[PDB]
């Protein structure tokens, strides 16, 4: 069974646990630094939406990131920098009919679903100072330990 | 299957994928038509750390963020939309194979991404693709678009 669901918050996630995120229609789904070397939001796209530059408001930060959806799938694009002063990259997207995402800390490393439903899979950057990463969550979450990464990977996929 | 050509600069014809088959090059494929769309593959080897490379795309020197925790092979698909951007990571082909694709086809420049076997295709869009011109640095196959599976099963199973 599944441990929540729980409400919108900011807090340091636990190791060895993945949070699988449940929004509805947010733009920033979720926001992890740990102010050193690790800064990956997670934003929503909808289905059908034309290359346009959008406005997220990311750990305070106004960017303007452009962003495309020709699929009627929902997609997560996974934005990424190691320094405090870069820019953003777009360093992966989940392509998703389920609406369901993946944070995960473990091992020296911030892990995250991506590909194409329903064949999503795993991956992970990395840093030095996991024990301070800390996330707000704009989303409805639950709470899934990594020996059941088997059902959050059906989730994620299947839903 | 019609090939293998010698890397080249030219206008590829509309309705057929050019199938790409690189060996080290870092830059695969650059394409553009000089004013609405700019795409670049990039060739980023296995078990890459995180780290700043530079690349010449279009003549211009670029600094770019990879990375690549895989056995695979990443083409990252470089892209822009006006000549004064900088450049966004737009799309990921994870590939044991070392094979791409591009093709111009309605209206739209076609790519593959995802992970192979499952890679899928998807399109930037262009008000004018016919001046889309690609600068090929990797031996290359053309496969018309009526044999798209073929292409697919290419690029997926090599």
Redesign the interface.
């Given at each position: 069974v599944l441990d929540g669901p729980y409400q919108p918050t900011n807090f340091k996630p636990p190791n060895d646990y993945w949070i699988l995120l449940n929004p509805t229609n947010q733009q920033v789904v979720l926001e992890g630094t740990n102010k050193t070397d690790i800064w990956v939001a997670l934003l929503l796209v909808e289905p059908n939406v034309?290359?346009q530059s959008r406005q997220y408001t990311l750990f305070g930060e106004t960017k303007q990131i452009?962003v495309?959806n020709?699929?009627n799938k929902w997609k997560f694009f996974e934005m990424f920098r190691?320094n405090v002063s870069a820019?953003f990259?777009?360093?992966?997207?989940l392509t998703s009919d389920t609406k369901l995402a993946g944070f995960m800390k473990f091992y020296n490393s911030v892990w995250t679903f991506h590909?194409?439903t329903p064949?999503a899979?795993t991956?992970?950057?990395?840093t030095s100072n996991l024990s301070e990463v800390e996330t707000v969550i704009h989303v409805e979450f639950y709470i899934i330990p990594r020996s059941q990464e088997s059902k959050c990977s059906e989730y994620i996929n299947t839903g």
């Open positions: 034309t290359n452009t495309e020709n699929t190691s820019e990259q777009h360093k992966r997207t590909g194409e064949h899979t991956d992970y950057s990395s």
